[PDB]
Amino acid sequence: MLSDEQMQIINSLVEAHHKTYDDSYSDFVRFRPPVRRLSMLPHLADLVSYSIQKVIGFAKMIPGFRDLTAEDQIALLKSSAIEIIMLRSNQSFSLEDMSWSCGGPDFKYCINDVTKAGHTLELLEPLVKFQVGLKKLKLHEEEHVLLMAICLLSPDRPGVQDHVRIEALQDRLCDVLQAYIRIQHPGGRLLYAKMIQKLADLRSLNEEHSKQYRSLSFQPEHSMQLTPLVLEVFGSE
Amino acid sequence: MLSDEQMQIINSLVEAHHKTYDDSYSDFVRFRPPVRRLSMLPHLADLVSYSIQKVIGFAKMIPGFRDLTAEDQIALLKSSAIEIIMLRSNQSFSLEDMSWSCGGPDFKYCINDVTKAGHTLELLEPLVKFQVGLKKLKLHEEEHVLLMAICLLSPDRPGVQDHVRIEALQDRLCDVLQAYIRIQHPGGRLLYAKMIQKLADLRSLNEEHSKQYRSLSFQPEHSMQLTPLVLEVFGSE
Amino acid sequence: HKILHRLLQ
Amino acid sequence: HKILHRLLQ
Ligand SMILES: C=C1[C@H](O)CC(=C/C=C2\CCC[C@@]3(C)[C@H]2CCCC[C@H]3[C@H](C)CCCC(C)(C)O)C[C@H]1O
Ligand SMILES: C=C1[C@H](O)CC(=C/C=C2\CCC[C@@]3(C)[C@H]2CCCC[C@H]3[C@H](C)CCCC(C)(C)O)C[C@H]1O
Numbered sequence: 001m002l003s004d005e006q007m008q009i010i011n012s013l014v015e016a017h018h019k020t021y022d023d024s025y026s027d028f029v030r031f032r033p034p035v036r037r038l039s040m041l042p043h044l045a046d047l048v049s050y051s052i053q054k055v056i057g058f059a060k061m062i063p064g065f066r067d068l069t070a071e072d073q074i075a076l077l078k079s080s081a082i083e084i085i086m087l088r089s090n091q092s093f094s095l096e097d098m099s100w101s102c103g104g105p106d107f108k109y110c111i112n113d114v115t116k117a118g119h120t121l122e123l124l125e126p127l128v129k130f131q132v133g134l135k136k137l138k139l140h141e142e143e144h145v146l147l148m149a150i151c152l153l154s155p156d157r158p159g160v161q162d163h164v165r166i167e168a169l170q171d172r173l174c175d176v177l178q179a180y181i182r183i184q185h186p187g188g189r190l191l192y193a194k195m196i197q198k199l200a201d202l203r204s205l206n207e208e209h210s211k212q213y214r215s216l217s218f219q220p221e222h223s224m225q226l227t228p229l230v231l232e233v234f235g236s237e
Numbered sequence: 238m239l240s241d242e243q244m245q246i247i248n249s250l251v252e253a254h255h256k257t258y259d260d261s262y263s264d265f266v267r268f269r270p271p272v273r274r275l276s277m278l279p280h281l282a283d284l285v286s287y288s289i290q291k292v293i294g295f296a297k298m299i300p301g302f303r304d305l306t307a308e309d310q311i312a313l314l315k316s317s318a319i320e321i322i323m324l325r326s327n328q329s330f331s332l333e334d335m336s337w338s339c340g341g342p343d344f345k346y347c348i349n350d351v352t353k354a355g356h357t358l359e360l361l362e363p364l365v366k367f368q369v370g371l372k373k374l375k376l377h378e379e380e381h382v383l384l385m386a387i388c389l390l391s392p393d394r395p396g397v398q399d400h401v402r403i404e405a406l407q408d409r410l411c412d413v414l415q416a417y418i419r420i421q422h423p424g425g426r427l428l429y430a431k432m433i434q435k436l437a438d439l440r441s442l443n444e445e446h447s448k449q450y451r452s453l454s455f456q457p458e459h460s461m462q463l464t465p466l467v468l469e470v471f472g473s474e
Numbered sequence: 475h476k477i478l479h480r481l482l483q
Numbered sequence: 484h485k486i487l488h489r490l491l492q
Binding site: 029030031032033035042046223224226227228229231 | 266267268269270272279283460461463464465466468
């Protein structure tokens, strides 16, 4: 069975996720509206920028993160922002229509929409396959929330300094994950290995996005559609 | 009477203004919506950012501008952007309600709205007085359009290099302005002097804004509400 | 990363 | 001022 510290970590992650994710997608009415040339780029850039804010709120509540140096926190966030977002967006992905359905016709992001944000099929093909692969896993909230924090606490990212300390933190979320699945998830003899496989997929999706984002950011007519936060997090400083 | 070159300059400015100003305020539906803490800041920053794009389209069509060096064009635009915008916004100012009325309840920008964009009364007091002062002048389109280009072509701005060449260009819009008023504006024996007085007012409003904008830009929680264009044009690079 | 900084309090 | 540059064509 699980230990006190191991369930404290679980209670904390679940609570943080609930404080930083909105199943109603209310604040989407505050974004630059969608348009369907790169019509969808302003709305989706607003979506990402918003998500980065929520990821930072999540990250600040992961046990041990707040005690890293500010550089290591930035290093981890710059490298893992897009992955955590790809991770949390699974909560809105629908298998019926292969789209993210954040509400009604306007906020129903299908494949043609994502291409009108300046991204090609080379990103879209494995991203969707990753989503339905993730959706089929039927994760519990604890596993989902643990996967996000495990991904964020990866020490194999550029710019990290204290990679033994954050490997320590990562090495222990994985313990909580393995213990949770064994005690509390029936029929999950294979689930942990499959979740760790998704982390590898995300590394690949990360590189494909940042490659296409480099192309957007180098074209001022498109980079001006971005937000300061986006440009800061995804920039090269 | 007016000369061929002097009316060519008039035809060009009037046409450029018509190509870069929309009396329907259609594209306002594309901005981040208004909210009424600095609630109004995202929508108004989107408004300014849009206006900067239209000012650049105007400026490119002023005779002689396109032949300045790219540095001088940038120098002129960075220093005079807010003034030209304060100038063009008079076309939407209403004396009945002392507000800019770009359409219906949402895009009716009154005094309380501008304060919810992080600007104090020290800017708002003389800006409104400038607007009704400008409104009472009852300018013809030619004078309005000429005032904008005269203001933009001021050589008394930081960063300009070829200040004799642009003083030459400015010194001749003023000629077209004086000639237009004499030949074609009845009862305007005093109008030119009064218009040149407005240029001085704008210098003062310019400094009051950029002083309050420096305060916004130094607070990252507010500067992140700005657009890249805004931050580029109003930045210190 | 000053925005990030302020967001990281 | 690269954005401005591109806008100034
Ligand atoms: C709150 C929620 C909800 O679950 C909805 C949610 C969905 C996330 C999606 C689906 C739509 C497409 C994007 C945004 C994608 C997440 C990231 C991959 C691709 C995205 C796009 C192409 C970025 C282009 C903008 C730049 C310039 C940054 O490349 C985000 C999440 O945080
Ligand atoms: C198309 C048109 C239409 O006539 C409408 C029109 C109105 C212009 C106004 C009235 C509303 C307030 C602002 C935008 C003001 C013009 C500039 C002075 C104050 C503005 C505000 C406080 C900026 C705050 C944002 C930063 C961070 C840049 O300080 C702009 C014009 O281009």
